[PDB]
Amino acid sequence: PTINQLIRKGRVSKVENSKSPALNKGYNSFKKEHTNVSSPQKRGVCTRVGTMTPKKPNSALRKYARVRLTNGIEVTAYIPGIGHNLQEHSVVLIRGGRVKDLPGVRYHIVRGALDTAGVENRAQGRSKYGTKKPK
Amino acid sequence: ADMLTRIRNANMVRHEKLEIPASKLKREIAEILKREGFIRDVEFVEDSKQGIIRVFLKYGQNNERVITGLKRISKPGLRVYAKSNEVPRVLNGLGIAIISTSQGVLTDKEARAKQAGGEVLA
RNA sequence: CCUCCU
RNA sequence: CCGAAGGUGGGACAGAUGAUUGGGGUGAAGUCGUAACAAGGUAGCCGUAUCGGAAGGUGCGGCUGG
RNA sequence: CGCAUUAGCUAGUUGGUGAGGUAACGGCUCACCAAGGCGACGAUGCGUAGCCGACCUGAGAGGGUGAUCGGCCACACUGGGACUGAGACACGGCCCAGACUCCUACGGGAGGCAGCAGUAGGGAAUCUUCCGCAAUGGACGAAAGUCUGACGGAGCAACGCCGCGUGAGUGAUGAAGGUUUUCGGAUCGUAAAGCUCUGUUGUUAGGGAAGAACAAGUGCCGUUCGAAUAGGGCGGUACCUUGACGGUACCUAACCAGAAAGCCACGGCUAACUACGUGCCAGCAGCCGCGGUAAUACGUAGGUGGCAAGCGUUGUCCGGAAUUAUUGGGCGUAAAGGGCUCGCAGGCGGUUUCUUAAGUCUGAUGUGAAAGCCCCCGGCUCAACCGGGGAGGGUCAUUGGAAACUGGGGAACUUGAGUGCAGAAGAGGAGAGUGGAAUUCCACGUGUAGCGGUGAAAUGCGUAGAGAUGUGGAGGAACACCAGUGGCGAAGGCGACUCUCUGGUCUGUAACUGACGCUGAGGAGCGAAAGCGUGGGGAGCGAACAGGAUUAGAUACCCUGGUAGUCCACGCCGUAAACGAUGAGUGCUAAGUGUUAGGGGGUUUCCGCCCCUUAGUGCUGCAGCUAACGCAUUAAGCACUCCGCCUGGGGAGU
RNA sequence: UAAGGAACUCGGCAAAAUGACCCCGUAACUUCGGGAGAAGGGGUGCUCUGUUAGGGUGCAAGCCCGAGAGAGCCGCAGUGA
Ligand SMILES: [Mg+2]
Ligand SMILES: [Mg+2]
Ligand SMILES: [Mg+2]
Ligand SMILES: [Mg+2]
Ligand SMILES: [Mg+2]
Ligand SMILES: [Mg+2]
Ligand SMILES: [Mg+2]
Ligand SMILES: [Mg+2]
Ligand SMILES: [Mg+2]
Ligand SMILES: [Mg+2]
Ligand SMILES: [Mg+2]
Ligand SMILES: [Mg+2]
Ligand SMILES: [Mg+2]
Ligand SMILES: [Mg+2]
Ligand SMILES: [Mg+2]
Ligand SMILES: [Mg+2]
Ligand SMILES: [Mg+2]
Ligand SMILES: [Mg+2]
Ligand SMILES: [Mg+2]
Ligand SMILES: [Mg+2]
Ligand SMILES: [Mg+2]
Fold first, then answer.
1. Which nucleotide is the nearest neighbour of A10, by CA and C1'?
2. In Å, what is the CA distance from B73 to each residue of A13, B12, B122?
3. Which nucleotide C1' is nearest A57 CA?
4. Which residues interact with strand D by a CB < 7 Å criterion?
5. How many CA atoms are closer than 13 Å to the CA of B25, on its beta-carbon side?
6. How far is the CA of B121 from the C1' of F22 (A)?
7. DSSP A53
8. N or C: which end of chain A has fewer CB within 10 A?
9. Which residues contact A124 (CB under 8 A, 6 or more apart)?
10. Residue from A20, A18, A44, A36 nearest A110 by CA
11. Are the CB atoms for A44 and A94 separated by under 8 Å?
């Protein structure tokens, strides 16, 4: 672009999108408005628990929750961990990671916000699945 | 009024000489360039046009130039005015910048001394 | 005319 | 006199929600054909019109990226 | 600061004059006059936001943030108003209104946690209903002192940063002990086994901080006031007194290195592997990707580099990202040249000279707090920290120069750009008329059984005489040959002939003009084909539609018909692979060879040949360019000006 | 015609309400004309200033038309029917 052109119309940066939009909206009960607040986790209530087939080249029954958050946005979120952590309609905490297989699942259910197990007797970094170290 | 491209183009094809329409500052540039050792002489003729004489810059008198690989760039119509303090040096020496002043030109020392940075070349 | 999935 | 709040009125704007409806995206192994890629078996593609379950077909003009 | 998918806004609005008000200038308020003011340099509207010192990041340009700490601003349950005064149009006031809390024997009163603590609620999430004014600072008072949730402390919380550590050091059984197995092992490992040396700190008892300056109260002496020795105050000068933390930091000294190691990571990026159990299951995943019965990336089990009570996970920002490119990118084919003009604004502009001095440059002076980061950097034992002198800090003033360049004025010039004059070629355009060939239909003569069509057929047309052949008539449309990488046009386009009207280009000449130029958002115009409106026309062709075939089907291709349309006038539409997939202008940078329209010059009477030359139009090919293909004086080369456009694919040209 | 106000009724049938002039203001939608008197609001008597400003007629005197203001006055109510 000519300098004159750059003066007339400047450069425009790319708008980068958040990979976790649901954790960016707060809420107000009074005003009934979403607010712009950078949250690391959001509590929610499980509206549906079940399984879903992953995309190619994988096959599985990937256990997930449709969850209704405090901000009022309904997300899907992956129940992580080996063994039955699926749970039922109940309060849960959520996290920001996509399941590459499952299309739409952009959030994990945090293991440890309530009754959990995950992978018991983890080799190292024993803090990802709510695995209380035994003695 | 760009002698630089005329020079570059002829310099690329190792031309002996070139005829550039004369103007006061294009005359005063060719002499700055001549300070190294280009131009031997010109032929001032009966003036019909104001530049018909040309600059007749002859940087390739012999087969190969001892002063070869002439290169210039910094000549935009957007005006670039240098501070006497912040005058650049081409290649950290080994190259000159024709900094148009009210009274002076050339090196970094010829900026804080002379003053007006004005035009800036390479 | 067509030629399952990894 | 000015005057907050209040009342009345008709507009403006923004969000939520709504029977139903529209395409869109995505989804290991569904159905129908085979349009494109080879001269892809009628060279293809562009604009436009019209027709047809569906890809598409046909007209007119254009392009070669035949 | 964002949005033009916000373009008009304003009516005390804009200025005047007068009066009033105000600490104060002023449509600040009002009266009476006019008609202004603002806005493409973005008014107005909508959205978002306290601003700044700074902070995070980055080579820097930049980008992001504006908790804690300092300054300016604003606000004090919501909203309005004044009072008091030097000063609020009041943070713990009032007056009034509203929604909420409290009291009220109902008439009426009282209050505002965005003060410290705390509670509920919201939330992923953020403390003690603590002690003291000893210190520092306030307010009050002559002082003692009182009040001070300011402030100092302490409680809480790995939420950070960091301490100096949690020793040093002598010491090879390489034991014990581990999970593997080619039934053997090997490394931790001088570190521990066995110790044996020191107290940063602390494992338990004794010493004990600094922080405190004092203010005064008192005793004294020079000074100035003093009717004065009174009697105080103010300069030097004694004496005097007080600690929340707290019996807490720090020291000694034992019990004694005992109390003080951690978390994460080990495919590759990035230095770091094997058993077993699963068997596309269960599960994993930042990216690439692992698992379907031998998983170095999953479940478990045993095994190792960084930084150091944490580190994993998620969230936000900058970097990497020369990935919005000013620094510092692009657009022939990867995303990207507007279909093409005419042009308003704007941007940009040949040469000389003179003058000007806005820009440009430069000297000098003033400020840009403190903290922070940083230059010398010192002190506190170095530190995870505090002081001074500098520096940065300004598209900043003010003033004095310089004057090349950019800009302004004056005078010149002719190379750009036009004019004149003389030639040239052309399917450039608009209008009217005219011609020949062929198709079709109609009529008629001759003639008679097929014609037509396809891969092969059939539907069709024919004995109501087709087809063929001859003659004539009617009508419409398109212009064989000429015809050529030929011509003309801005592009779309333009092809029979003639006339009428009319645009541009090229060459030559330089008489004239004397930068009159280039580009050009928006705007206006033109713009293939198809389509649309009204009215015409309708031969041939032919979307649709029908029939015949073909085929599994055939809403296709092939055949036979055939409507709109194709044509004309006027109007509309505004798009095409509107392509050279290549914006316009200008200059510069090897050659060779065709061709179109000119010009000049050779010996020649021309023709003709040859040389040169301008403007097109092609081909080949240097240098250079390119991811490559290729481009290459008709650049995709080297430059400058201006415009348009691009920023992963989809979603969506929705 | 109290209070109510469509509960009436097949159905607001009938009745009530609205109603003049001046001023402000006026949406969807549209064939761009409209919609529109949309809707919704405000003013309205009398006196004085006042034979107002201004206009018609006329040589003048006069006669006639006549805003908009300001200050008042009265009533439950001013296009008082
Ligand atoms: Mg096909
Ligand atoms: Mg095909
Ligand atoms: Mg069809
Ligand atoms: Mg705000
Ligand atoms: Mg960048
Ligand atoms: Mg392509
Ligand atoms: Mg492309
Ligand atoms: Mg183009
Ligand atoms: Mg544009
Ligand atoms: Mg047409
Ligand atoms: Mg028509
Ligand atoms: Mg046909
Ligand atoms: Mg287009
Ligand atoms: Mg074309
Ligand atoms: Mg194009
Ligand atoms: Mg132009
Ligand atoms: Mg009644
Ligand atoms: Mg009543
Ligand atoms: Mg009823
Ligand atoms: Mg009834
Ligand atoms: Mg009625």
1. E324
2. 30, 14, 6
3. C6
4. A 53, 55-56, 59, 103-104
5. 12
6. 80
7. P
8. C
9. none
10. A44
11. yes
